[PDB]
Amino acid sequence: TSRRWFHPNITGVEAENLLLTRGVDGSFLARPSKSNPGDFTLSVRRNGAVTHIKIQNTGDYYDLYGGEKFATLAELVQYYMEHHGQLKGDVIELKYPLNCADPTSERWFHGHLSGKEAEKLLTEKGKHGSFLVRESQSHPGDFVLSVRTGDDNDGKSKVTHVMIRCQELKYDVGGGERFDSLTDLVEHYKKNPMVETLGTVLQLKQPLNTTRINAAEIESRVRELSKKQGFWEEFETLQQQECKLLYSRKEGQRQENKNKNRYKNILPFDHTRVVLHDGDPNEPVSDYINANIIMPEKKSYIATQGCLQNTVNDFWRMVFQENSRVIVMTTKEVERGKSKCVKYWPDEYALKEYGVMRVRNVKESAAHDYTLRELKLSKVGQGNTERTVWQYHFRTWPDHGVPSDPGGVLDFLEEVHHKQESIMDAGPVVVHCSAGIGRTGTFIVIDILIDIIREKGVDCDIDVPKTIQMVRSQRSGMVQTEAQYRFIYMAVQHYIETL
Ligand SMILES: Nc1nccc(Sc2cnc(N3CCC4(CC3)Cc3ccccc3[C@H]4N)nn2)c1Cl
């Protein structure tokens, strides 16, 4: 429910002193790493001392040093808080989250925002119950809560401002309880709304949205985010909302399915996973594959992992069952000496049987950025089930970070979109990388946003963090890093500029 153990604006020394003076043995927090930008550090207190554990994310997963790989920091913390002797050669316990007081990553916090700008934003894009917290422009250290109430400009709605005083490190609205953080204050008055005289209830229903913008304003917004809502503040605000997406992944945790996962803790949500049917009645569990349906709001997607040698047959069962006609692979088979995906397709002009499924590689066409493989997929023993599956194998995604220019990705996705659109009643587009959350989520999110612009031009609303959060509700940790977050903005900006 909460993610208060993540401190966005703290240093290693500040983490140590915070755990030593305000924590106990078993207390812990997470924080960004300043020695390795883009990475993170888990700081845990033990025996009166603090240990720092490195968590690196190059774009595919959160790699805890000496631990396991996870899709989100919340799923990481959730894993070790219920599994006692996993984290370590001495064993380490995650017992008490040390809660952050910084309101930086809260959706309703907007920092240095004037009272007139707050009224303007709430006027133009706010609804009944839309609220925000801003710094007081007159009293430094104080804050203002601005809420919109009314019926959903004729005076039927209004904007009310509530002063938040900071008195001896505590916050209050002029009376009642005093809170140790703006988060506790906001949470309290969401549960117990303020009622002014004459009966108006100041309902804190939803934060003010400042990320949804018109498509033509993307270039301006990217310029604002590149130099106090920046890229980091917006991304980390979205990251805080990952704690609402801790849905069960019990099917992927079953004993019969552990070896079907490339990474044992990066698993599909039960409620969106692709369930395979008509499996072998002798195999006890034959319905599982590490893959999720991704629906926008239009095409749909299957986000999945790179095949293992023992999941190739299930991969083709999935492609056949879901009537998929296009596969997007955004990784080499080997990258930096590490195996990311086994070769699940035949050589050119060759024919292979993968279990009950038969695949012919009809022709390969090589572009600079990608290779296209025209495959015929059919069930063995049934010559009436054949259908063409077009595999688009993106080859030039860099080993480190994201592409410096999105033109290769955009031309790639444009070709994939038109191939899919030209096939009547085609199923979802299969997208995969290694773990199937990082590059895969980035490609899918860009494709979703570009499809909106392709049909609506510049006169359409797009909301990058809202789209990512909606996609993240269907597969764990879709879009992994801030570099990918920035790349999505730049690809959308580049696509608009070439309209
Ligand atoms: N469903 C859904 N829909 C839309 C968005 C989201 S996340 C999200 C992402 N970004 C934002 N803002 C608003 C809050 C700020 C970042 C910009 C603005 C600001 C200014 C100064 C200092 C810090 C901050 C951040 N606190 N809100 N929600 C989600 Cl989860």
Side-chain angles (χ1 to χ4, degrees):
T1 332
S2 98
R3 205 167 168 267
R4 322 257 325 250
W5 39 259
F6 187 82
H7 299 233
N9 285 304
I10 72 157
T11 68
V13 171
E14 289 174 339
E16 271 168 28
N17 303 147
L18 213 57
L19 291 156
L20 284 173
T21 60
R22 297 217 224 136
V24 298
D25 286 342
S27 301
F28 69 92
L29 53 84
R31 61 194 176 84
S33 179
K34 302 201 194 288
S35 63
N36 293 126
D39 291 359
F40 306 86
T41 309
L42 177 68
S43 303
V44 192
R45 177 178 158 153
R46 312 156 23 155
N47 321 304
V50 177
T51 325
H52 305 277
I53 298 143
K54 186 145 128 201
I55 298 162
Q56 148 179 53
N57 197 321
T58 53
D60 306 319
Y61 39 65
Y62 294 87
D63 189 357
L64 185 174
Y65 194 77
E68 259 307 317
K69 296 167 181 73
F70 301 85
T72 67
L73 287 181
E75 289 191 358
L76 185 152
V77 166
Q78 186 185 47
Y79 176 79
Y80 291 113
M81 284 194 71
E82 338 305 351
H83 294 74
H84 52 90
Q86 274 290 287
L87 190 51
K88 286 149 192 186
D90 284 74
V91 171
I92 184 74
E93 293 169 313
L94 296 194
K95 286 211 257 216
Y96 314 105
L98 194 148
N99 290 337
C100 187
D102 194 350
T104 288
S105 62
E106 294 276 15
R107 284 200 68 208
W108 40 257
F109 182 71
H110 298 272
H112 181 88
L113 190 77
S114 42
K116 272 181 162 70
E117 185 76 65
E119 277 170 53
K120 185 173 247 185
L121 296 174
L122 282 166
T123 283
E124 291 168 354
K125 55 235 281 172
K127 260 183 137 262
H128 162 74
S130 304
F131 70 104
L132 62 99
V133 171
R134 50 188 185 81
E135 280 141 345
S136 187
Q137 66 274 77
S138 48
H139 304 274
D142 277 19
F143 291 84
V144 188
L145 164 83
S146 309
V147 197
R148 172 175 168 151
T149 48
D151 198 316
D152 287 328
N153 290 18
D154 42 304
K156 232 70 83 193
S157 283
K158 52 177 275 214
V159 167
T160 311
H161 301 267
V162 177
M163 293 308 313
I164 294 168
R165 300 96 164 146
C166 185
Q167 307 193 69
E168 310 280 56
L169 309 154
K170 290 194 177 221
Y171 302 91
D172 68 88
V173 299
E177 300 311 308
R178 297 172 61 223
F179 306 91
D180 293 310
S181 76
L182 297 172
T183 297
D184 295 328
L185 187 146
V186 167
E187 280 307 307
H188 176 268
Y189 288 111
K190 285 158 79 174
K191 184 56 234 173
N192 303 289
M194 296 171 267
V195 197
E196 49 182 41
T197 204
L198 288 163
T200 289
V201 180
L202 301 184
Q203 231 156 54
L204 317 180
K205 275 190 73 263
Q206 65 273 324
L208 173 83
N209 184 301
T210 85
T211 55
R212 172 184 74 253
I213 65 192
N214 177 267
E217 310 301 323
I218 285 288
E219 175 194 311
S220 325
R221 176 56 58 92
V222 170
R223 241 202 313 277
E224 309 174 35
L225 300 181
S226 306
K227 271 102 182 79
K228 38 269 200 355
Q229 174 191 332
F231 266 130
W232 177 75
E233 283 86 6
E234 189 175 301
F235 182 66
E236 285 304 324
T237 296
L238 168 65
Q239 297 293 86
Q240 188 195 295
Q241 297 298 306
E242 83 187 3
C243 67
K244 296 178 181 160
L245 308 176
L246 295 169
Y247 305 127
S248 67
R249 312 153 299 131
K250 289 174 172 283
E251 290 302 320
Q253 288 165 314
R254 312 225 279 141
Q255 176 59 44
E256 299 95 347
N257 290 334
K258 309 198 154 283
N259 289 343
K260 299 166 193 174
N261 302 306
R262 186 169 282 274
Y263 310 98
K264 65 172 288 282
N265 293 303
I266 298 177
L267 306 173
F269 290 137
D270 291 329
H271 76 292
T272 59
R273 77 183 179 95
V274 184
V275 183
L276 306 183
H277 319 95
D278 309 89
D280 206 77
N282 293 295
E283 184 183 10
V285 180
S286 59
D287 76 329
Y288 179 82
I289 184 164
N290 194 320
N292 298 92
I293 299 281
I294 313 291
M295 290 184 269
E297 294 192 74
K298 282 283 156 74
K299 84 181 66 101
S300 72
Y301 314 82
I302 291 169
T304 187
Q305 64 179 18
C307 285
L308 301 164
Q309 198 44 63
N310 61 311
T311 72
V312 168
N313 297 357
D314 300 322
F315 178 90
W316 286 116
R317 275 173 67 216
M318 178 179 64
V319 174
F320 184 88
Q321 167 186 288
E322 299 299 316
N323 201 34
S324 296
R325 308 302 181 80
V326 177
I327 296 167
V328 175
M329 165 184 198
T330 66
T331 182
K332 298 182 180 80
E333 293 164 67
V334 198
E335 282 181 0
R336 273 159 66 69
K338 246 94 154 73
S339 193
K340 307 291 177 194
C341 179
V342 308
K343 190 169 166 289
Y344 60 86
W345 60 97
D347 303 332
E348 188 175 34
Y349 311 121
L351 176 82
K352 288 254 181 223
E353 291 190 0
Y354 303 107
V356 302
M357 294 301 161
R358 182 182 284 138
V359 178
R360 179 183 296 286
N361 188 333
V362 173
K363 192 70 185 76
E364 294 194 0
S365 317
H368 173 70
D369 287 310
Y370 68 95
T371 298
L372 170 61
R373 304 195 178 84
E374 171 176 357
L375 319 176
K376 316 287 119 143
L377 168 67
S378 68
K379 211 190 200 253
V380 303
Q382 281 165 258
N384 55 321
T385 68
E386 201 175 66
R387 85 284 315 277
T388 300
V389 181
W390 305 86
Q391 189 212 30
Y392 286 85
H393 186 182
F394 198 90
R395 278 168 11 212
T396 64
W397 189 278
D399 293 316
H400 300 280
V402 304
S404 60
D405 196 287
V409 169
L410 291 170
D411 297 349
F412 174 81
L413 284 181
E414 196 75 11
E415 186 61 36
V416 169
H417 172 81
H418 284 102
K419 177 66 68 171
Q420 169 81 0
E421 196 188 345
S422 74
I423 302 161
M424 194 80 13
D425 280 80
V429 172
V430 176
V431 185
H432 74 85
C433 49
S434 54
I437 63 183
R439 291 182 209 180
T440 290
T442 301
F443 272 81
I444 283 175
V445 162
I446 292 169
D447 194 70
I448 289 165
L449 298 168
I450 262 59
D451 200 24
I452 291 161
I453 297 162
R454 192 193 282 102
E455 104 165 302
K456 286 178 192 283
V458 316
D459 313 310
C460 66
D461 292 330
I462 68 111
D463 192 346
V464 176
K466 190 198 176 187
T467 297
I468 293 177
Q469 180 79 353
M470 172 268 302
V471 165
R472 279 173 182 182
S473 75
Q474 302 171 77
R475 184 161 169 91
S476 290
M478 298 278 276
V479 186
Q480 276 289 288
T481 64
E482 195 195 315
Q484 296 166 344
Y485 194 73
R486 291 173 186 245
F487 182 76
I488 292 166
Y489 264 97
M490 149 171 108
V492 169
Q493 176 185 204
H494 274 231
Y495 183 84
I496 293 159
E497 286 181 5
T498 64
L499 278 176

